[PDB]
Design a protein around this nucleic acid. Structure first.
Ligand SMILES: [Mg+2]
Ligand SMILES: [Zn+2]
Lengths: 221, 143, 94, 1111, 170, 56, 14, 110, 55
DNA sequence: GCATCCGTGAGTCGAG
DNA sequence: TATAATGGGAGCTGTCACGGATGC
């Protein structure tokens, strides 16, 4: 029930590394050149550092700061680019009627083992969730019709099937293959991820895509 | 994004990438007016070609063209958009020589004109929807 | 949230169509002074003052409330604009 | 209160005068106190000398002198005058072969003076000239990035004094020199300098294969005369190489000490690097008939010796603080002096021809304007010349020790990448690692370390103590960053018995890198930990416990602390807080031992030993650049005996001579109903009750009356169509009366303007007719109090044309200034911080009875959410809070120095002693453990906080030693389930207050060309709905909202007018029309010869100018 | 730059419902001024609009019935809050405002994440949607309570963080 | 024990099942109680709360 | 470029 | 004169002209007022007969923007100039009555 | 009529003179004393328009 | 076909 | 409205990475 431990575990605040710096040792620091010092800071923030340790740490602090300062503009610029490319793209109709589609793999070939291993949960969820089915799919005695927007549950089901070797990949409608002019169609786009339902025709999909891709920009290290 | 612990739907990245692939390079005009090596939108060539082949003419041979978000952005049909985004003088001179007309398809164009945008409550789909109470309804039903 | 928002989204093929219907209806209410309303006296949206409860001045609140009832009809090309405006001016003069 | 200081580290020397970097620099630059014949050739004296003599008649410089200021500082600030001294120059005009000399002392205008504390007054407003860091001139060698094998030799002079030159080996093997972006073979220049193939062959031959890449037959044939002209033709085309021109150009490029000035520091760097002796700061010399080389051959020798690896030849770091120097105010100002001077000389030469050739006095020959304007330019529109930041004494003291990469002859920020920003190992004891701006400027702006000094050459030096044998001398050597790299330097905290090193193994640095060493190998040792950090950083106690990233914010924010009417020094101090009040002149002190004669709110009269009676006026309620009140208050009483250096008065934000930025409040670290959510802070109404965090502020309002072509602007109490209610507080002349309380809308100074050309509308005529009244001649232009502003009128000033001593800018009849004061209580939205980087806005002011409180009924002052600590890793605030508790009960304050201070054991002991007071009294007063304290103790031992089975008192003490107490929720009376951290924390009220920042607008001022609303609160203008905000509306698919933003709410004129009128009449807003800025775009494109036409769906043109622009 | 746009410091509003914000009286007086004039005319607070505006011009001339009228003016209406950088569409959200004394804007704890807002001095800008259409768009499409899931992933954006987790977990 | 993830999932599921208007209500509830409890729970930080393992 | 240079040259032609 | 493009701040973000208001084009408020005035003058000219309203409209230039001599208004109505003078004066007098009674145009005192 | 398109093209000297309400023959701007716009200069009313409406 | 030149970009809002 | 006078003068350097054209 320790306050640090609790705040971390709950996800209220804090993470393991920070807790480490508070309680255990501070760790190794890096010179400005990028290569790390031979002696680590042994002190914790509880114990307090030595002026030498402290100064040693300042290099990293600063490097990080400047990094963030620059990445910020890099990301900003990126976002503006993306917005400029995607802006005209809007949901302009319910069905472009295309027969085409894209095939989302549940298995990624592992090069370390030269074998095949199931994709991670979140990866697959990101590939499948709220997508309309391009083709009918039957796994574990459940029929998933064409035109069916996959619920998070639907996706979990499909994963479980893929664990029973029932299905290796899923056919799905997608903007890549959509044949709507000057935009996209409801079916090819899928869920308005914000409402967990079919996207309403007229939603500005491009701008949303740009904002979505770019907003985390400053977080990528 | 995954490495950085960021949940982001493939959908969006796909939306952008599709715009990266929006263009093609011409390998043979066949019997078309277009000339070899010249870039244009996959849409436009698919349409033209269907006109040719369906009219009994030789089709145009085209090659897929990948180009980054910036170049693609500057290559958009709308000159208001392109001239807004970057390379204003270039875009504008190349546009003015050609005497381009902007059809106001995109958000940017309309924002610039102060127009009501083609998305949301401005979408032609829902834009014209009417509301009338039953009373007035039957009332006009007489004709 | 707005009351019955989920139902309202239920009513339409596109959320933006909901928004349009609501906005237009509100414009109607304002134009004809609320006297064209499909709400009955006990359904009339109310507002707290120092004096007491008076009709809610907010036409959009009204509009959505009305929409919930189903007393309202919406869609495209229901009636020519002339006929609409004029029949309404006959039924509820300004 | 008793003051206990921790730590055994002894400071062998105190901190240098903190503003000496400014003060000493300018002092040396002016040399005003030095007698003209005793002056060294530096600063102003150097400039004059470099400019003169003015050749062809010959005008020569003898000496110069500085007068006294025409007005005192206070006079200057009041009148909007620069504080300056008159500069005169004694010049003698000499006719050569004509014998005659005509000598005169000409007036060159005024030169701004630096004040006692290191600032300037320029046009009535205080300014600081920030020191500028840059690459030291010299000769450096940096590895070519394209080829690993080949290095590049760079020759860099002082900025604005000659072009940089680059020497490279080349792929082919021929040496190349780059000057002004043109490369040519170095051998040509070598020849021009009188070098012969032989002379070179013996010199550079030792390094094989390179010399042959040097040798070119044709050039060797030519000699200097042939080769000089060849070179000249390489340097510029299409210009005749008349030999005198070639000599003039190459001389002006290299040998001319006037056009090409290496650093004196540059000179030294060259000498030390290449092991040579320069006869001057020039690259080459003209002696007798021929060019003579100095720098080139040695740098070429070094370059070659480097390319082929030769022991003893180094590559240059170029971010090493040995190769980067500081240009202080003296150097910068002097630079501009030299420029304006060179221009003045240009004018002299120009007038040495036209006009009377025979009758010229030096007065006739010389024009000041170039000089006056060069100096005025530097002090007035320069980037390094900044509005002085004096929010509080520390603000300015720090502003002065600021170091900037940025500025003329400086990095642009596209220039600035990671290398420059970084904290270099040589910043140790020179530049502070912590204190730097947050964001875009990170690494560029920085602060000087506490013990650091900038030397004559502009290199930053740091003190160390000599260690010979095992003994540590008290002798301090100030070292440059380069010299420092020679020695093994022990850490200050290394244990000592006497002057002897007490440890078998000590921590030392060899060239910045840490290593464990024997006392035998220790050459020097740090003076103190303080030396590693800035003055601001040195004010953070427990700094060793704070993560650097937050310490940074602590430092930076102390600069933002507002001076409070009841200000206190922190209960925990680092021990620098007194000397800061000292070195920044805020507090007033006694000159010599003496006795206080008189003591008033306005002045203090002291009789010294000398018998002489000195009177000290006190600054009272004077406004600062930031609007915070600067006033001093007497800290002594009549007949009191005071020694030399004793405190006579307190500055703004000091307490008995100790720096007082905030207040010490009783704080509890616990969440509170989400009101301290995400850094927000919860405050006790008791704080306002006792006027904690209340601060005085003065705003200055100004208005002018001018001569219109339509008539005079009159400042009068007579304003057309105004009630007596409106004019009530206005005196006879129209100016609000001192003492009057003014609110938004109120008139500060009445003023009438003459109405312009009047086109009375027919409506105006019918109306005017109906009421029988006549339209007045004058409009009402009186100055009113802006929205959200106001207070008490503390001052007025009035200046009229043609009254004694006053002259106003042409056309200006009169100028009035109203000073309005306000006493600001702490409120919701206001910003508080501590020295550890904890900062937050006040979200809730709770009535005392809701405040968590101790069993004895004492309520807490502030409630800080603990969630703020773990992520931030700033533990200093925690220890500060604990020791703050102990102090709270023991009635004492502490000094806990950085990196040598109170360790937690000692804090625990003090805590125990405090507990005895806390609980002991209670026991004596006849009370036992409360029923609730038992429950809390239960849950506590469930938390492993106390030892089970021990007594309630023993356990409560066990918690107190951990800094925790039983806390009662004021709402319920029930306790907080766990024991909670309570203690005294030092917290400041920062300069950011909602009062300043709150703003809103319906409609207002629009812009000339665009017709879009103006920006900024002061212009009363709309907020920028930018590209990104638009994107946001687009994504929501909120069309009509967006369209409003783009039309009705901005630059659609018809639209915004119609909207306003409709909303006024309770009608729905109209359809938006075309935005005026699109019309602006169309016309701006037409001006560009491009035809832009809006079209039908039928392609027929559409006229958006509505016929107005078409014939 | 737009009309009817203000700015102030933000401060946490633990007590408000997800669809609300604290909007300082004075700010509201300015932002909705025209409306407040018309209303001031409907009630007899002033002879007409031109008079009303003068009454609002001098701060000391402002009676309490003015405030009461203002409460009537903003009824049902929402305003847009925006923090910069506006990285995604959730950088602007609509809230029905609750007039408060004091000078800072009160923001709901659950929306801070989407705004990347916090309370170390963050400042936000307010905007008044004018038309029935704009107000409709705001209340239906942009209302905070109607956007609870990220458009990026569809994962909840409005969720317990910090203090809420600390209590619930406890 | 309820924490970041669990609660997120709760919210999402409620959004799917109950619907948004209710989910809003649930969010205000979680907010209210969460705060209320957080304050009385007696969470705090003293220096002693950074616990150095004997293993260090 | 540098029109001054060019013109000076054209002048030096006569 | 000084440049509207004179930079404000060490950042290239703002120009001097950016802080210069537009004193020419009427404010939405001013415009509003100027229309309200027309509507109120018209509302006040309805209490007059069309002739005694038209005499004032004509002589103060509310129409065509020109003021007519009493003689010309007399010619337009067919009355003697002195007649038009007296019906103009009685018109204006009735206007003043309506005003002292109703308190409408007062706020346009400015 | 409603605007559905925006064309941009080169202008011929003919078209440029078409737009033009007059030629600027003088580098003058505003009269030094009166401050009224100079005749045939950059700010002329005869060319660009009246400074005051309907006057 | 690769070297190298010129030209164009490089977050937002705020205050000032 | 006339002695003769005849080719300028300053510069500003510590980014970085791209597309596209131009030249070797
Ligand atoms: Mg913040
Ligand atoms: Zn599709």
């Amino acid at each position: 029930f320790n306050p640090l431990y609790v705040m971390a575990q709950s996800g209220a605040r804090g993470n393991p590394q920070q807790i480490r710096q508070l309680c255990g040792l501070r760790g190794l620091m890096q010179k400005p050149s990028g290569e790390t010092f031979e002696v680590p800071v042994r002190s914790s923030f509880r114990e307090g550092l030595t002026v030498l340790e402290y100064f040693i740490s300042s290099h990293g602090a600063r490097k990080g700061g400047a990094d963030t300062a620059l990445r910020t503009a890099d990301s900003g610029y990126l976002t503006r680019k993306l917005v400029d490319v995607t802006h005209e793209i809007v949901v302009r109709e319910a069905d472009c009627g295309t027969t085409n589609y894209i095939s989302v793999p549940l298995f990624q070939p592992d090069e370390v083992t030269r074998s095949l291993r199931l994709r991670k949960r979140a990866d697959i969820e990101a590939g499948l969730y709220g997508r309309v089915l391009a083709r009918e799919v039957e796994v574990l005695g459940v029929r998933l019709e064409e035109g069916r927007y996959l619920s998070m549950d639907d996706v979990h089901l499909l994963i479980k099937a893929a664990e029973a070797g029932e299905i290796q990949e899923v056919p799905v409608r997608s903007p890549l293959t959509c044949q709507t002019r000057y935009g996209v169609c409801q079916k090819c786009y899928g869920y308005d991820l914000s409402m967990a339902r079919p996207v309403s025709i007229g939603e500005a999909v491009g701008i949303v895509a740009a904002q979505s891709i770019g907003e985390p920009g400053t977080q990528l290290t | 994004y995954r490495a950085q612990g960021v949940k982001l739907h493939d959908k969006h990245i796909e939306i952008v990438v599709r715009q990266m692939m929006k263009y093609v390079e011409v390998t043979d005009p066949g019997d078309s007016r277009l000339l070899e090596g010249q870039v244009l939108e996959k849409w436009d060539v698919e349409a033209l070609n269907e006109r040719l082949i369906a009219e009994g003419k030789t089709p145009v041979a085209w090659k897929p063209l990948l180009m980054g978000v910036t170049k693609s952005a500057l290559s958009t049909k709308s000159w208001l958009s392109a001239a807004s985004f970057q390379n204003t003088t270039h875009v504008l001179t190349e546009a003015a020589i050609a005497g381009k007309k902007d059809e106001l398809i995109g958000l940017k164009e309309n924002v610039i004109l102060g127009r009501l945008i083609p998305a949301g409550t401005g979408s032609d789909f829902v834009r014209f929807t009417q509301v009338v109470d039953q009373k007035t309804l039957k009332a006009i039903e007489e004709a | 949230a707005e009351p019955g928002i989920d139902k309202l989204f239920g009513m339409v093929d596109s959320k933006y169509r909901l928004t349009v219907v609501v906005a237009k209806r509100a414009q109607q209410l304002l134009r004809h002074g609320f006297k064209n309303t499909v709400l009955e006296p006990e359904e009339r949206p109310k507002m707290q003052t120092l004096e007491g409860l008076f009709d809610d001045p907010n036409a959009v609140t009204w509009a959505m409330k009305e929409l919930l009832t189903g007393r309202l009809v919406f869609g495209e090309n229901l009636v020519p604009e002339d006929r609409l405006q004029k029949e309404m001016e006959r039924l509820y003069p300004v | 209160m008793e003051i206990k200081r921790f730590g055994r580290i002894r400071e062998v020397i105190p901190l240098p005068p903190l503003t000496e970097i400014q003060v000493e620099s300018y002092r040396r630059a002016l040399q005003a106190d030095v007698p003209p014949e005793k002056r060294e050739n530096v600063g102003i004296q150097a400039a004059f000398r470099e400019t003169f003599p003015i050749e062809e008649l010959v005008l020569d410089f003898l000496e110069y002198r500085l007068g006294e200021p025409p007005f005192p500082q206070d006079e200057c600030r009041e009148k909007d005058l620069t504080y300056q001294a008159p500069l005169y120059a004694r010049l003698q005009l000499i006719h050569k072969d004509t014998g005659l000399i005509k000598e005169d002392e000409v007036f060159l205008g005024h030169i701004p003076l630096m004040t006692e504390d290191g600032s300037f007054i320029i046009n009535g407003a205080d300014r600081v000239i920030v020191s500028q860091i840059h690459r030291s001139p010299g000769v450096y060698f940096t590895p070519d990035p394209a080829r690993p094998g080949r290095y590049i030799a760079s020759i860099i002079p002082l900025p604005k004094r000659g072009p940089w030159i680059d020497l490279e080996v080349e792929p082919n093997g021929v040496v190349s020199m780059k000057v002004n972006k043109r490369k040519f073979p170095l051998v040509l220049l070598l020849r021009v300098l009188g070098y012969d193939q032989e002379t070179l062959a013996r010199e550079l031959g030792a390094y094989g294969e390179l010399v042959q890449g040097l040798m070119d037959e044709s050039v060797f044939a030519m000699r200097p005369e042939e080769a000089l002209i060849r070179l000249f033709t390489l340097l510029r085309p299409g210009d005749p190489p008349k030999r005198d021109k070639a000599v003039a150009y190459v001389y002006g490029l290299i040998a001319d000490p006037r056009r090409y000035d290496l650093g004196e520091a540059g000179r030294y760097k060259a000498e030390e690097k290449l092991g040579i002796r320069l006869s001057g700061r020039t690259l080459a010399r003209f002696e007798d008939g021929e060019f003579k080389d100095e720098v080139f051959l040695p740098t070429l020798r070094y370059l070659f010796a480097l390319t082929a690896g030769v022991p003893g030849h180094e590559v240059d770091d170029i971010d090493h603080l040995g190769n980067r120097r500081i240009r202080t105010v003296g150097e910068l100002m002097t630079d501009q002096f030299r420029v304006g001077l060179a221009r003045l000389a240009r004018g002299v030469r120009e007038r040495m021809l036209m006009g009377s050739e025979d009758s010229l006095t030096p007065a006739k020959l010389v024009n000041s304007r170039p000089l006056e304007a060069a100096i005025r330019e530097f002090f007035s529109r320069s980037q390094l010349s900044q509005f002085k930041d004096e929010t509080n004494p520390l603000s300015s003291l720090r502003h002065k020790r600021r170091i900037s990469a940025l500025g003329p002859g400086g990095l642009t920020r596209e220039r600035a990448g990671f290398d420059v920003r970084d904290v270099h190992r040589t910043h140790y004891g020179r530049i502070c690692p912590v204190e730097t701006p947050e964001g875009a400027n990170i690494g560029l702006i920085t602060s000087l370390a506490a013990y650091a000094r900038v030397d004559e050459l502009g290199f930053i030096r740091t003190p160390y103590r000599r260690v010979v044998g095992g003994v540590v001398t008290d002798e301090v050597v100030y070292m440059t960053a380069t010299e420092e790299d020679r020695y093994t330097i022990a850490q200050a905290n290394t244990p000592l018995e006497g002057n002897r090193i007490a440890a078998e193994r000590v921590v030392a640095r060899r060239k910045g890198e840490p290593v464990i060493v024997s006392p035998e190998e220790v050459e020097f040792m740090d003076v103190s930990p303080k030396q590693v950090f800035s003055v601001n950083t040195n004010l953070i106690p427990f700094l060793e416990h704070d993560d650097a990233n937050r310490a940074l914010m602590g430092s930076n924010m102390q600069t933002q602390a507002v001076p409070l009417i009841r200000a206190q020094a922190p209960v925990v101090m680092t021990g620098l807080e007194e000397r800061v009040v000292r070195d920044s002149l805020a507090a007033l002190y006694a000159e010599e031992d003496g006795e206080v004669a008189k003591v008033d709110g306005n002045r203090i009269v002291v009789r010294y030993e000398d018998g002489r009676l000195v009177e000290y006026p006190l600054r009272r309620f004077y406004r600062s650049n930031q609007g915070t009140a600067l006033d001093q208050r007497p800290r002594v009483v009549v007949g009191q005996r005071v020694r030399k250096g004793d405190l006579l008065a307190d500055g703004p934000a000091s307490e008995n001579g100790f720096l007082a930025l905030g207040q010490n409040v009783l704080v509890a670290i616990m969440p509170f109903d989400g009101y301290n959510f995400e850094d927000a802070i919860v405050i006790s109404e008791e704080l306002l009750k006792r006027d904690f965090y209340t601060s005085i502020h003065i705003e200055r309002y100004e208005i002018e009356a001018r001569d219109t072509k339509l008539g005079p602007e009159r400042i009068t109490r007579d304003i057309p169509h105004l009630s007596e209610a409106a004019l009530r507080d206005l005196d006879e002349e129209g100016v609000v009366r001192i003492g009057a309380e003014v609110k938004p809308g109120d008139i500060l100074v009445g003023r009438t303007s003459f109405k312009g050309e009047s086109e009375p509308t027919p409506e105006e005529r019918l109306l005017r007719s109906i009421f029988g009244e006549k339209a007045r001649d004058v409009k009402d232009t009186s100055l009113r109090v802006p929205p959200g502003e106001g207070g008490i009128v503390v001052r007025t000033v009035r200046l009229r044309r043609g009254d004694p001593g006053v002259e106003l800018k042409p056309g200006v009849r009169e100028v009035v200034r109203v000073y309005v004061a306000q006493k600001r209580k702490l409120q919701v939205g206001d910003k508080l911080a501590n020295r550890h980087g904890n900062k937050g806005v006040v979200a809730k002011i709770l009535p005392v009875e809701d405040m968590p409180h101790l069993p004895d009924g004492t309520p807490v002052d502030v409630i800080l959410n603990p969630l703020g600590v773990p992520s931030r890793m700033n533990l200093g605030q925690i220890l500060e809070t604990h020791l703050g508790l102990a102090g709270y009960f023991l009635g004492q304050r502490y000094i806990s120095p950085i990196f040598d201070g109170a360790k937690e054991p000692e804090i625990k002991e003090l805590l125990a002693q405090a507990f005895e007071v806390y609980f002991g009294k209670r026991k004596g007063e006849g009370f036992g453990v409360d029923k609730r304290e038992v429950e809390v103790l239960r849950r506590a031992e469930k938390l492993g906080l106390v030892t089970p089975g021990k007594t309630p008192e023993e356990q409560l003490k066990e918690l107190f030693l951990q800094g925790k107490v039983v806390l009662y929720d004021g709402r319920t009376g029930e306790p907080i389930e766990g024991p909670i951290v309570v203690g005294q924390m030092f917290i400041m009220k920062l300069y950011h207050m909602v009062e300043d920042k709150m703003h809103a607008r319906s409609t207002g001022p629009y812009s000339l060309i665009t017709q879009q609303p103006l920006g900024g609160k002061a212009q009363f203008g709309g907020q920028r709905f930018g590209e990104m905000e638009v994107w946001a509306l687009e994504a929501y698919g909120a069309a009509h909202t967006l369209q409003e933003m783009l039309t009705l709410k901005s630059d659609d004129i018809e639209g915004r007018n119609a909207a306003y009128e409709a909303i006024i009449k309770g009608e729905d807003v109209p359809e938006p029309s075309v935005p005026e800025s699109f019309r602006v775009l169309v016309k701006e494109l037409q001006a560009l010869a491009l035809d832009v036409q809006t079209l039908d769906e039928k392609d027929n043109p559409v006229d958006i100018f509505e016929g107005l622009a078409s014939k | 730059r737009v009309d009817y746009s203000g700015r102030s410091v933000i401060v946490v509003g633990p007590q408000l419902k997800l669809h609300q914000c604290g909007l300082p009286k004075r700010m509201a007086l300015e932002l909705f001024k025209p409306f407040l004039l018309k209303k001031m005319e409907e009630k007899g607070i002033a002879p007409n609009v031109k008079a009303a505006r003068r009454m609002l011009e001098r701060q000391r001339d402002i009676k309490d019935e003015v405030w009461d009228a203002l409460e009537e003016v903003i009824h049902g209406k929402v305003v847009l809050l925006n923090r910069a950088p506006t990285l995604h569409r959730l950088g602007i959200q609509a809230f029905q405002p609750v007039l408060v004394e004091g000078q800072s804007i009160q923001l709901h704890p659950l929306v801070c994440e989407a705004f990347n807002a916090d309370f170390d001095g963050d400042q936000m800008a307010v905007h008044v949607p004018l038309s029935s259409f704009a107000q409709a768009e705001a209340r239906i499409q942009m209302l905070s309570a109607h956007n609870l899931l990220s458009p990026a992933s569809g994962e909840p954006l409005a969720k317990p963080s910090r203090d809420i987790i600390l209590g619930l977990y406890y | 024990p309820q924490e970041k993830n669990s609660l997120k999932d709760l919210v999402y599921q409620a959004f799917l099942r109950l619907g948004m208007e209710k989910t809003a209500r649930l969010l205000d509830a979680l907010k209210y109680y969460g705060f209320t409890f957080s304050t009385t729970s007696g969470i705090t930080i003293g220096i002693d709360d950074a616990v150095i393992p004997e293993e260090k | 470029s540098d029109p001054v240079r060019q013109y000076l040259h054209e002048i030096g032609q006569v | 004169p000084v440049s509207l493009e004179t930079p404000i701040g060490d950042e290239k973000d703002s120009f001097y002209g950016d802080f210069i208001p537009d004193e020419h084009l009427p404010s939405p408020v001013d415009a509003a007022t100027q229309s309200l005035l027309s509507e109120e003058l018209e509302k006040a000219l309805s209490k007059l007969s069309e002739r005694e309203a038209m005499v004032l409209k004509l002589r103060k230039g509310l129409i065509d923007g020109r003021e007519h001599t009493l003689e010309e208004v007399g010619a337009f109505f067919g009355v003697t100039r002195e007649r038009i003078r007296q019906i103009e004066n009685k018109a204006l007098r009735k206007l003043k009555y309506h005003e002292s009674r109703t308190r409408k145009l007062r706020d346009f005192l400015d | 009529k409603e605007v559905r398109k925006v064309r941009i093209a080169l202008a011929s000297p003919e078209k440029i003179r078409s737009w033009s309400y007059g030629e600027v023959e003088k580098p003058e701007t505003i009269n030094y004393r009166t401050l009224k716009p100079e005749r045939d200069g950059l700010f002329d009313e005869r060319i660009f328009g009246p400074i005051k409406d309907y006057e």
